[PDB]
Amino acid sequence: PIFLNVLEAIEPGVVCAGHDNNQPDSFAALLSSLNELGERQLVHVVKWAKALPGFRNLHVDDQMAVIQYSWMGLMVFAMGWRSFTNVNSRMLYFAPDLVFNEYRMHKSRMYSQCVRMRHLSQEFGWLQITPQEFLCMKALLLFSIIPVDGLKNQKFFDELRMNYIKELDRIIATSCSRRFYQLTKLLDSVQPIARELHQFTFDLLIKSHMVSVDFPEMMAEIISVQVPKILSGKVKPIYFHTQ
Ligand SMILES: C[C@]12CCC(=O)C[C@@H]1CC[C@@H]1[C@@H]2CC[C@]2(C)[C@@H](O)CC[C@@H]12
């Protein structure tokens, strides 16, 4: 299980948000902490991605683009997994020091988005997703959103995505057909959630001053340069099933 060995080996560890749980729950503090959590996770996602089998075959500009477009989905998926394995989807486990209960989902002004995320988390249980399945699915998420006009070296990307899809089917192995169908359906469901968060973070960045919400360096640049390309339709997610 060479492929599975690698994915398990490179899987990022625990990342705290640095939230002061002693201070009252407020939109400002919660979102600021989420943004800081995102900055920290971004660092881990970059190291993880670059250590993925074949990732370095991609053109260098494509390497960063793929990461900059797929980070929302990747982080939402892993967070849903953490919520499943830690609190059985009861709450959203963003970090050990930033767990969202219903009250926080409301104060964050992202209640509808959190609902979709908790639903995603519940799916891990309803589908009995295995740790091994989780890992391959997460890897595939990195190769699930690109420029409609293509990447610098689209062929390298296509071969890479193909091989990761084949690995998912592999660990899966009538029954297998049902399983693959279900996991690809689950993967597709991540995209709508990611787009809602893209829209939300974009709007929040634009009015960040007014509501006292702080965005760290990497987050601000990516959200003002990359995210708009997605919201304007220049960059679109890759779906398995027709939407
Ligand atoms: C990706 C993060 C942080 C990592 C995670 O566990 C998932 C979570 C999903 C909501 C994101 C948050 C990062 C900061 C964002 C983008 C806020 O600006 C609004 C939505 C937040």
Swiss-Prot record:
Changing C114Y: In AIS; loss of androgen binding and of transactivation. Changing L31A: Alters receptor specificity, so that transcription is activated by the antiandrogen cyproterone acetate. Steroid hormone receptors are ligand-activated transcription factors that regulate eukaryotic gene expression and affect cellular proliferation and differentiation in target tissues. Transcription factor activity is modulated by bound coactivator and corepressor proteins like ZBTB7A that recruits NCOR1 and NCOR2 to the androgen response elements/ARE on target genes, negatively regulating androgen receptor signaling and androgen-induced cell proliferation. Transcription activation is also down-regulated by NR0B2. Activated, but not phosphorylated, by HIPK3 and ZIPK/DAPK3. Ubiquitinated. Deubiquitinated by USP26. 'Lys-6' and 'Lys-27'-linked polyubiquitination by RNF6 modulates AR transcriptional activity and specificity. Phosphorylated in prostate cancer cells in response to several growth factors including EGF. Phosphorylation is induced by c-Src kinase (CSK). Phosphorylation by TNK2 enhances the DNA-binding and transcriptional activity and may be responsible for androgen-independent progression of prostate cancer. Changing N88T: In PAIS; 50% reduction in transactivation. Changing V45M: In prostate cancer; gain in function. The modification Phosphotyrosine is found at Y239. Changing D214N: In prostate cancer. Changing T201A: Found in prostate cancer; found in bone metastases; alters receptor specificity so that transcription is activated by antiandrogens such as cyproterone acetate. Changing A78T: In prostate cancer. It is linked to Androgen insensitivity syndrome: An X-linked recessive form of pseudohermaphroditism due end-organ resistance to androgen. Affected males have female external genitalia, female breast development, blind vagina, absent uterus and female adnexa, and abdominal or inguinal testes, despite a normal 46,XY karyotype. This is Androgen receptor. The record marks K50 as: Interaction with coactivator LXXL and FXXFY motifs. Composed of three domains: a modulating N-terminal domain, a DNA-binding domain and a C-terminal ligand-binding domain. In the presence of bound steroid the ligand-binding domain interacts with the N-terminal modulating domain, and thereby activates AR transcription factor activity. Agonist binding is required for dimerization and binding to target DNA. The transcription factor activity of the complex formed by ligand-activated AR and DNA is modulated by interactions with coactivator and corepressor proteins. It comes from Homo sapiens (Human). Changing I2T: In prostate cancer.
